[PDB]
Amino acid sequence: TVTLCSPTEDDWPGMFLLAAASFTDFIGPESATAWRTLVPTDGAVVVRDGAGPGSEVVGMALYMDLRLTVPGEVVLPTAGLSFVAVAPTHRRRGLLRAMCAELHRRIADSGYPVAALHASEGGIYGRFGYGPATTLHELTVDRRFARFHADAPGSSVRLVRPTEHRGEFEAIYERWRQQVPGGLLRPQVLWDELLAECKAAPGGDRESFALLHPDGYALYRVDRTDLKLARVSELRAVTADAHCALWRALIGLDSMERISIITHPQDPLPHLLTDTRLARTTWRQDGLWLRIMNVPAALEARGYAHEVGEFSTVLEVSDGGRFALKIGDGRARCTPTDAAAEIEMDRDVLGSLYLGAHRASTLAAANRLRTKDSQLLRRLDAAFASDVPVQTAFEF
Amino acid sequence: TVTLCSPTEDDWPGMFLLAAASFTDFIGPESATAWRTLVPTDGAVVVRDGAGPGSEVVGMALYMDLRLTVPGEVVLPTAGLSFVAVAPTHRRRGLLRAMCAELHRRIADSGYPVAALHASEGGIYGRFGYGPATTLHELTVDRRFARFHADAPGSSVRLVRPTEHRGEFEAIYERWRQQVPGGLLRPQVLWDELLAECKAAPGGDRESFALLHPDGYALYRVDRTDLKLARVSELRAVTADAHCALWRALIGLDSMERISIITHPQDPLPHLLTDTRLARTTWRQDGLWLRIMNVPAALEARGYAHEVGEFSTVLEVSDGGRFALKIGDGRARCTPTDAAAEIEMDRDVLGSLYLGAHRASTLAAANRLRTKDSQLLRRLDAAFASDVPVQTAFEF
Amino acid sequence: TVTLCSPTEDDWPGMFLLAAASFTDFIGPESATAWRTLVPTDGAVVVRDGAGPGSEVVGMALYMDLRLTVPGEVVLPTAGLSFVAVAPTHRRRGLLRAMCAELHRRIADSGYPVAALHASEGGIYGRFGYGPATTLHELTVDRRFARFHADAPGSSVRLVRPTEHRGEFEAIYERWRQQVPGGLLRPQVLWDELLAECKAAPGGDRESFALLHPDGYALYRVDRTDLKLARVSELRAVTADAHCALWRALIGLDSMERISIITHPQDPLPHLLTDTRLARTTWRQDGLWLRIMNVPAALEARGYAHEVGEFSTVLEVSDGGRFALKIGDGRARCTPTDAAAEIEMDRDVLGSLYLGAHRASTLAAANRLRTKDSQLLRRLDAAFASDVPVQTAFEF
Amino acid sequence: TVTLCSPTEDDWPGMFLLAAASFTDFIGPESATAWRTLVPTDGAVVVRDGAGPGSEVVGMALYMDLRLTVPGEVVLPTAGLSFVAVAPTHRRRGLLRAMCAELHRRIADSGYPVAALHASEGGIYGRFGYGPATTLHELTVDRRFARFHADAPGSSVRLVRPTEHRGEFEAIYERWRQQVPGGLLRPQVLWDELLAECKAAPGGDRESFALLHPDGYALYRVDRTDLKLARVSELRAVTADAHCALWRALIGLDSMERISIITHPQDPLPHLLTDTRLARTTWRQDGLWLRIMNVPAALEARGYAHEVGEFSTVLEVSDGGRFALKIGDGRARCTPTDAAAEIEMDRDVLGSLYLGAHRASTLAAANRLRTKDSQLLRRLDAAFASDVPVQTAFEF
Amino acid sequence: TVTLCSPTEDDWPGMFLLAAASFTDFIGPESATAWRTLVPTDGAVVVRDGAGPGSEVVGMALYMDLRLTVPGEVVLPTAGLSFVAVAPTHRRRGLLRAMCAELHRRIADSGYPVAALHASEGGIYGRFGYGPATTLHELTVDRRFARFHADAPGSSVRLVRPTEHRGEFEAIYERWRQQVPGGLLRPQVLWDELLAECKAAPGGDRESFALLHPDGYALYRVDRTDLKLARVSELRAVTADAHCALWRALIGLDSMERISIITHPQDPLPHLLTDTRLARTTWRQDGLWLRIMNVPAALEARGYAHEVGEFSTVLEVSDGGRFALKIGDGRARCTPTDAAAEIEMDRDVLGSLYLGAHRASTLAAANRLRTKDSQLLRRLDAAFASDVPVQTAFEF
């Protein structure tokens, strides 16, 4: 009946159709064919219904080749899952399990230490070993009241047409993504896509503008629905100076009542202002999800906090191996063992800890993470934290 | 014209009137006379307009004697400011500055290391040296979809009439407030007040119920405005088991669509569920604000993280003294010095760091906190963190 | 651990507490003690948690002795389930199954042909053999535009204080409930309850008024939330004349913009007006649910349409017996058999057909009701229909 | 001053202008020129203001040649009124009466037994003898909770691009419209129009998709305003199997929260689900309106229920003739007479009964329909009912 | 650093960019290049940031050459400020003061007696001597209830395509603007702009229609957001007959529930109807703002009410000269003096009085306008009033 296989070029139109019916944002396929360049040979799986010549697609999934920055400014090859979809006609038939299992084998065999995704819903991917690893934080600032604090840094920012400063944006983003956990390399093809969206579309979005600083930029747009709201679609700042100068400019949009931005929980913006409330948290949600494919490769690859003293323990990941884990001097050694476990957790929990967005002690309080001693917990909690707060790059 | 002095009993009615006109929640005065028992002799200041027999009150402020738990389970005498109010007729005349200055002298001279408040607005109290020190986090759970995770702990909880289990609530809260930074001792008079509110009021709030566990409780009520919403006014859990069992009971309120609660950012509830999104953050705001009155007394009183190795630095608080600050083995020594400062911050910033709710590195990114080296920052950031996440007790 | 038994008077307070926590409308218990008089000795079951002296109630259910009118103006003893509740602490432990099974045995053994309920949710009771048997239909009339049709009947109606015309209301309701399927006898104790609600409550509902006609009445109130909306809580009309005259009076409430009423789908009101749209359907929902306890007793008790010619068939109710069903001259004979079934359905489907609110052919289209021939379907569909449209009496 | 006449081609632009100003949906005229092919020579009337060369149009009306299915699967030539409009400058001058009178003479003389329309408002057309004859029923399903009942039928449905399966849609619709009262033949020109709308329009509607089954289809689209709502613009199912399979697919649109559809009151969807409430009635309204042009031709043309035994009566339609009406064996004979009337009604009432959407007994309760005996009423009510529930085809 | 100068053609693109970022309505620049023809040589100022070749624009402002009608049907050369904008990066640096000061010198030296603007916010321009001089009044009529009064005048109005009756619109507007204070000459280039907007835009506004009378017109459109709302974008009526006939036509839009229009406070529409409430005031706001450049030229140019008897006084405008003001026979003489002032006001107050939209006595009650005697006040109040109520022409 159902067969699982790598798509042919003859499978494309079926895939585009399924995609269009599954993702509202989809159209255009032309953009789909930009992301396609990020898909390695054999990075795609489809499920066909039946057998014969061109039987219809009813399931699809793929991964893209990505570079993710993890704490200690270390960059990992990362397999980014996307365009995962099952036909509304074939829902509870195990297609998602089969497609994910097949994709994970390929990802493992190809040597990725880590896989990642953005979840359309929050209850799907834990079962596959993905844990929420970054946190999206919407701030809406009522700029009518906003005054900067005497201490705040600061002219240096220019109001600019996005399409005329691509080189400057690329260089800034590139510096940004290398320094911040969560950072993703943004390939030329994605800069084409992003740059194009800047022009106003009738019936769609208004034209975008940019605020450019030698060390950061912001891209923003008036909201279509509300005309006193400015939406900051992206703000990449490499220094604190740039971050503040950009916000002085945004708060300068006197035509507006409110500025909103999707940011991270440690965004220092509230502290730039004399009234920290004006920077109001309007929304929160999981951002990037991680599946640790290879536990020791991943644990050894990232840097750890230097503050915690050297310690050793035994970590067991449910159906993922048991390891002697030694952390000291910001570095980890992670070797096979059969000594008794001191800590245990499912694979997804590990991905949630990995970039420091969640504290081990919080996971432990929910019993996801079982441990021997509170001391070990406090150490796992200090070691795994990140000097530079974790942020989210572009969705995929 | 205006005179500042300690109220007489002849000043009360004026004060009640001003209070009623300044705080919507005020009425009843009868409750005002419960909190009055918490006000020390000389803990109150009023401003009278003119001179003569019973000239009208136009300004008032006071503090209450409180016990606040800070990291390391250390309990500090704390002066809690409340009922601070200026007549709408006397707004920009310096009454608030005068009343706060006078109150702070009294508080300092009386030996409180720390003062605290809940802010009616976010832009008033920084100028007086108070910094936001805890964070309120509203979670609304759509319990229709909520399923507990296989790992989650768990019968043990009873549905109970609040008024018939005061002794059990008192003992549980008492254990709770001694273990959690942000915890406040709740005196008998406040248990009278809180217990009374439990009965339904016509035109007002519906009757409250309680979920009682040997190690925790929750008090809740159906919302007046929305009848598919259950409001958890208070949940105190001393163990993780109790926390989970209480939430299994709340999610058990099948008559409801949504449960909301004002909680703290590290509440582990999202991780009890198979879909972490269901536990949605609907609101965020500063909770308790702190003014460090005596810097060395306060810095020496609290415990510090054991993970960070011993280090020494020089801390300068703007118009608050310069100190040689030595932290090691979870303990701090804080002595006078005139050596060059390595770190500087206004007083309010220090109160924001004090319970660990804000990271020094985030304050530094906003330039509030100026420092010499990033290393010192990472250390100040690890040392000041709290093993047990900071929570908020009752507003005052 | 858990025990199922008939409540003692010592179990009451536990039951009241559970009730209060399960039903928002509950309070007052004093009203609970009116309905209690409708509960037969042994009509109540509770589940206690554990054993000992006064272990806490965690489950309760009961039935009331009612008289229900079914097509052909036949009145059946009916067991009305209500106050069914499981503690939020004991949700998926089978308490509802156990309590319902126990109650049904008692109801069967006591000789009720039928049981009934109003469902708090639509997905609970089918599993217990109850089917939706009446349909609530909210109409909101924009009376600003409403003009009566030249044909409409029609002075005879008086604006009246409800509390001063109880005898007239009782007599009218009594005539009403004897003629209409869905009609329930309303005992003196329920007239006390209903009459009391008429007075305005501060913070609650405004005072009610009545429109009285020799052959019908309406009770109404201005909405608390909206002051241009009049809510008709009850309209009982015994003749078409009375129905029209009452509506001319209601449309006469010039102080109002809208009149709403919960009515039945065949309410002729739309056809009284020159613009049938003004009578807008704002809400629809299942009303009374029926469980046929004794199939042949129930099928033989009701009248059937005289129009359909005599026919015979074999009806099988899943786990409910197989019967030779003979319908002719508005009367049915229903005898045991083992001949092959011509029609099959679960018990709940039968309750849905029983008062004529649902057509057999519609149930069959959804495959709930499996039959041999379309002819039999059309006959079952004509025979079971009701001359007088089915209406809903008071909720319980 | 005003003249009434058949439009010239020189009158078109005036007519298009009036149309554009009267119907928001109008534009495009290009579509107007598709429907024009359905307009018979002499099926159009305009009113010109004054006399001379090209005096301006101020009134227009026309009818289209249609085929309507009535109970017993009988197809009648039907004159469909549309594009009826009076200039805002000439409102109460009798233009609508004059245009309708003129159109009706033409329709009568041409031999249509029946005329039909969709009403822009509910209070206009009764005066012209049209009665509401079908009922639109909006159901919104919260598909997040929807589970199918164990009994429900059921793979067989494919997700499909509408534009690539026209032949299959045509054949299915054609079977559908021949079996269902309310069915209209959909000519090739209307399939061109409908097929075209399927593509996404910027600023307008998103692209449509189809679910195709050998025996039915559904066309749907995400809502422009709300992105968690899927709108089913059309669902034609010829068997119950197809109807259920299509709904399993729609409930399979996991990307959505709600599915809505405009359907008929006997849609069996609620009964496919374990919780019948999920299929919520959000809106109700009159669909197709009928004017019986020739009473005996129309009464003799349709089939009647076989269940009711043969009976005879005398029907008088106000200003529409008196007839001896004999119904038996699903067939009616309708002859002229002057015997005393047993039943009387206006013409519009008859159109409301004609397809079985309204019961005679309900019309009688509102006094529109005056009759001699209740027995005759029950018979008129059983005879006129429809085996197959009446549905609405495309608006016109 | 910053330089203020007349833009080059090389400065345009910078100016367009700033414009686009400052005004949501901006795009298109192509329209900007229509208004440009209204800008005199030297009517534009820009601020450049720095010095060099093509340094970026950060501030811009200009004025257009306009003709404004003032009471007594006198037409004044008026400098109309628009496209005033400061970069969000240069907000509190005095750019607006510098640009306005420079523009005012040019305007004064060029011989304009008056300058005018439409304010983006209400708190900016008083400091520059502009006072609100006309009042926008939104009326929303619920046309479902609207009946005209027996007295109301009144066929004569035609429903018309705007683009086909430009000549008639021009002539009518031209008569209108010459008779009404607030009237502006509308140049051919602005008729091109306005005429173009009439066509429907996908994703944007629906197509406009016109109601044409020999002595007036209305342009209207269905609202994009709400489809039962008709928006009257413009109604110019030269006689009362035309005004009433146009409103009879608008109330004739039976497809609509509501008609809205931005009008003036003395619009007689409410008095045409039997229920004056139906014409509901939904919004009010300042329209045109005036700066009197040359006090005596302006005071002598306008007509004054003939009713008030001749009187003389001494008027002082803060930093604007002192004048002996003599008003009699609808004419004023305004000569220099140093006699003591009898009345004093800031310049902006004078602009607010100038077209009669505000009464001197109301300004005096707010103490803006200080005077010697109440008698003088009553005279200044009668003299300055306008026979013909002041209206607002097109925004600029």
Curated annotation (Swiss-Prot), chains A, B, C, D, E:
Main location, first listed in the record: secreted
Signal peptide from the UniProt entry: none
Catalysed reaction, written as an equation: L-lysyl-[protein] + acetyl-CoA = N(6)-acetyl-L-lysyl-[protein] + CoA + H(+)
Main enzyme class: transferase
Control of this protein's activity: Is potently inhibited by several small-molecule that share an isothiazole S,S-dioxide heterocyclic core. Some of these inhibitors, when used in combination with KAN against resistant M.tuberculosis, efficiently overcome Eis-mediated KAN resistance by restoring the antibacterial activity of KAN.
GO CC annotations, alphabetized: bacterial extracellular vesicle; host cell cytoplasmic vesicle; host extracellular space
Gene Ontology terms: biological process: aminoglycoside antibiotic catabolic process; response to antibiotic
Superkingdom of this protein's organism: Bacteria
Annotated residues for binding of acetyl-CoA: V84, A85, V86, R92, R93, G94, L95, L96, R97, S120, E121
Complex and partners: Homohexamer; trimer of dimers.
Family to which this protein belongs: Belongs to the acetyltransferase Eis family.
PANTHER family cross-referenced by the UniProt entry: N-ACETYLTRANSFERASE EIS
Protein name (record): N-acetyltransferase Eis
Species of the source: Mycobacterium tuberculosis (strain CDC 1551 / Oshkosh)
